[PDB]
Design a protein around this nucleic acid. Structure first.
Lengths: 97, 94
DNA sequence: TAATGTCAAATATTGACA
DNA sequence: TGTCAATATTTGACATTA
């Protein structure tokens, strides 16, 4: 991952900067998981899960999708909510090989 | 009937810690001895009046294909401008 | 087995809708 | 208050190398 990372940041919401900074040392800077885990006082399992979060977030949402923050009646708030689930579901089974 | 000036002073005091002082909801909750659910609803009433939308309305932030993203972006419009019509004409249920 | 990375389970906290 | 999902974490086990 190069400047592809810096383009993943919007979709890297819900994660913190340390979780993002840490995974960037691995995916872009080429550092090792176990090395940075010792650098920032962490289990090597967390740094595994940290990047896997950053990585999966890439596969979960294509860069074409748009981020929309909207206030709705409770009836229709579930609809858009549920349709994103069905929309992420449809992207998910395409990853297959 | 106004909406921001309608609320109890404590809610505006609670919500000021969250939104202005940057404090967390659970923080001000334990600070003023209330549940973290009460502070969430307390703040929400402020954000819904500042959003001039119904209080029962729920926010939804979501990633969606652009086709369906303009679909939902239109729903907010056909809701903001739906209640806007119900306020002046439902009194004409005569 | 030393070293790394992943799968797994399980903890605490927050902020959401009921 | 109950509950859930998503964070922030942990140890333990385990496949895989050199």
């Amino acid at each position: 991952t190069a400047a592809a990372f810096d383009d993943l940041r919007p979709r890297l919401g819900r994660l913190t900067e340390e979780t993002i900074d840490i995974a960037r040392e691995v995916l872009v800077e080429g550092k090792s998981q176990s090395d940075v885990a010792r650098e920032r006082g962490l289990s090597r399992q967390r740094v595994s899960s940290m990047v896997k979060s950053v990585v999966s977030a890439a596969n979960e949402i294509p860069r074409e999708w748009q981020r929309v923050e909207v206030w709705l009646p409770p009836n229709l708030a579930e609809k858009v909510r549920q349709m994103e689930a069905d929309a992420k579901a449809d992207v998910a089974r395409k990853n297959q090989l």
